[PDB]
């Protein structure tokens, strides 16, 4: 028995591409994983749910050839409506031409083969080790909400359970 | 032109295949549960009338030891064989039989467990009467089958058999 992806690395980011190619063999299982806490297995004798904590994340490439602006959201994705609702968050990346930042680009494009190391004027990479470490020691801080930023969090949470609402259709 | 065949029912308690252990050998047991695959009928031996031997010793009777070979055993006198059995089909009575393994049925059986089932082997009249799908009222007779110990001058497994079957269940 070996379990790949949502059980290989687990209490960990699980990081996916071509998102909407998963067909739906990856599709309703990780449609649990949204419930997290579990991925159930009845196939042969073994009927166990076993622990995907993994943590989810996806590249999502619409269908071809491109995003068209004037198309409502959702028409480029060709997932689910209802699995949409389960991640958090998303970010959607348009590339759209503009003569000013396409230069930098094709200047950063050309900063290949020219040369091997990419940055300048001014960044300073942050390395892996030393990161992560700051990465993990800040899982254990476990914070408390108080209260004041909780009401808060009801309050404005309100107009956002209006204009995303009083936009209606 | 008699070969008689015993059979006994209203047995004191139904037992299941899970229930299956070696004690019950050379004892009757009542189970019942679903057909599998019944095979086409074909004779038993009981006894044949093999000889010679070398050259001619029409020794008939026995050799109903499971395998079912060989006559020519401490003949004839004086035949001396050894040699060849040498087989006489004509002489030999026969009867049945079938092969037709039960399954266990799925009421009693504890999801998920994908139940496990050997054969009942129909010698006797009772051969037969089977249909498949049906559970039945069987005879136990534990026993064995040849195909972990060996006979220093093997492998062995489960063999229900029944000398009498009903159709109920």
């Not at chain 2, 019942?32 to 009777?61: H, Q, W």
Request: with cysteine; charged share 25%; net charge negative.
């Amino acid at each position: 028995l070996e379990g790949g992806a949502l059980v290989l690395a687990d209490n960990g980011i699980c990081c996916i591409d071509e998102f909407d190619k998963m067909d739906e063999s990856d599709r309703t299982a990780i449609h649990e994983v949204m419930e997290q806490q579990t991925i159930s297995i009845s196939k042969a004798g073994i009927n166990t749910t076993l622990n995907a904590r993994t943590s989810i994340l996806a590249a999502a490439n619409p269908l071809y050839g491109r995003y068209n602006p004037r198309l409502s959201p959702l028409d480029n994705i060709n997932l689910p409506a209802a699995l949409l609702s389960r991640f958090d968050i998303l970010f959607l990346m348009l590339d759209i031409p503009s003569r000013d930042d396409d230069e930098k680009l094709a200047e950063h494009v050309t900063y290949v083969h020219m040369h091997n190391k990419q940055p300048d004027l001014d960044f300073t990479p942050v390395e892996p080790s030393k990161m992560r470490e700051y990465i993990a020691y800040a899982k254990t801080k476990r914070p408390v909400m108080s209260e004041a930023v909780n009401d808060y969090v009801v309050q404005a949470y309100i107009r956002l359970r209006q204009d995303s609402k009083r936009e209606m259709d | 032109e008699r070969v008689f065949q015993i059979s006994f029912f209203n047995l004191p308690t139904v037992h299941r295949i899970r229930d299956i252990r070696s004690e019950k050998i050379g004892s009757l047991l009542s189970i019942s549960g679903t057909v599998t695959r019944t095979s086409e009928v074909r004779p038993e031996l009981y006894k044949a009338s093999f000889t010679c031997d070398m050259c001619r010793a029409i020794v008939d009777n026995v050799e109903q030891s499971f395998k079912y070979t060989e006559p020519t055993f401490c003949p004839n006198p004086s035949c001396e064989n050894r040699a060849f059995w040498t087989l006489n089909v004509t002489r030999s009575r026969f009867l049945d039989w079938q092969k037709v393994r039960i399954q266990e049925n799925a009421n009693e059986i504890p999801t998920g467990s994908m139940p496990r089932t050997l054969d009942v082997i129909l010698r006797g009249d009772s051969v037969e009467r089977a249909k498949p799908g049906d559970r039945c009222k069987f005879t136990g007779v534990e026993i064995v089958v040849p195909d972990k110990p060996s006979s220093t001058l093997l492998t062995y497994k489960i063999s229900f058999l029944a000398c009498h079957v009903i159709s109920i269940g």
